[PDB]
Symmetry: C3
Subunit: 162 residues, 3 copies
Amino acid sequence: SLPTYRYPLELDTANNRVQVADRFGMRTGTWTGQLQYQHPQLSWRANVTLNLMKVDDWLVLSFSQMTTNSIMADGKFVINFVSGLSSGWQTGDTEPSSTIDPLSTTFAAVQFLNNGQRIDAFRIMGVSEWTDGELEIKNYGGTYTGHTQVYWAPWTIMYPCN
Amino acid sequence: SLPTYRYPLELDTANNRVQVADRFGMRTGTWTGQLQYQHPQLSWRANVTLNLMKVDDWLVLSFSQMTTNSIMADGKFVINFVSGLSSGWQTGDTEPSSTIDPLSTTFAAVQFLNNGQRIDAFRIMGVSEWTDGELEIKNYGGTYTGHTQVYWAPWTIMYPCN
Amino acid sequence: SLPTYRYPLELDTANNRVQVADRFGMRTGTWTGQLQYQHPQLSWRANVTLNLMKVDDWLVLSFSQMTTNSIMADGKFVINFVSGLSSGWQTGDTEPSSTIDPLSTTFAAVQFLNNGQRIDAFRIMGVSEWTDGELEIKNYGGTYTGHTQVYWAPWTIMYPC
Ligand SMILES: [Cl-]
Ligand SMILES: [Cl-]
Ligand SMILES: [Cl-]
Ligand SMILES: [Mg+2]
Ligand SMILES: [Mg+2]
Ligand SMILES: [Mg+2]
């Protein structure tokens, strides 16, 4: 008896052809919410919109340029996927497929604004944890100087998500 | 009636076995051309050879070490895939599978040369656009100093390409 | 006559359903051994544990924070997968699927310790070669200062495997 096929595999009945679904290589969405920065001496919330892309067994988060308040030498960022996901996306779709820490690391290019001067620097960001829809991205450090505001260039980060 | 299979799925007729093609996990090539740097105050073309690799639904570009003329604080790099691709590759094979911007970001390690002195720095590069075979990689910034020449360490960048 | 299926494809006989194996999207392991640093003027070995993850046709190496001896402006790191792999993993499972150099590059955030002072900097790391179980990660450079010790923040690197 002929088998059925489980996603990403699918049967195209018009041509009687088994294939990998086109959505598997690319599924887009957006998340609109508040990016939370957390540190014992400083915490804030900034309104952001991220582009999302599921590519095979990976989830890619794409940040456009942003201006945020000042940050400490290290700290953590939290994205709450409980609300804000575009249609077709469920909170569970952002859950990592492993509990290894870090799952992924990337660098974000920033300018620290101090007085009137812009100081180019970097921030190392690690996907560290997911708990009931809340994704934790730890900022371990990077180059630092005293500042009043942060200009973040665009950046992407991805993690295994199946 | 028995179905047919669409790439990356294939039927190995010798053993009557359905499998994912071996080329899906790795398909190599090269691109030989001129890397274009663009900025309103400074533009140039540098002869380069890139190694390419299609890994699942991703395209990886691999740059070897290079020496280029000086650059501005920000600007853009253009790779014209209209010509220069090795055999088996078509221009269309480099097209991203989404219009999200940035699709991907990476850091390139550089040394800025300022008459004898080598100044270590970084450049953030973002895959930004593809138009009729021309790939645009924006350089948002990074650390900077006045210089006459740039020594680029090797780097890779990848983007969803299905 | 009905075909058979080669991994990652599999037939779930209970439901007569063809699927991609769940392990294909994620297979974990660990490697315990000595990370080797090599340079003509300075060489050392440091005891480390890495987390590994096979994700589709990629292998991800995940480093936790570490403190190592000093390093030169450039040099190379060698991970010997001949021993130390957790159960279910063979040395051959870490072999890259191409000889292109670099296969992948990433940045590691560090602090260079110069007797009391911590200097934030970066290191560019490239997956460069694999020879009989020995993976070579070249450190092309990055920002640098004279130092006595290195504090490395956690980092991941991956390559087609
Ligand atoms: Cl859900
Ligand atoms: Cl074409
Ligand atoms: Cl083996
Ligand atoms: Mg402030
Ligand atoms: Mg010049
Ligand atoms: Mg020492």
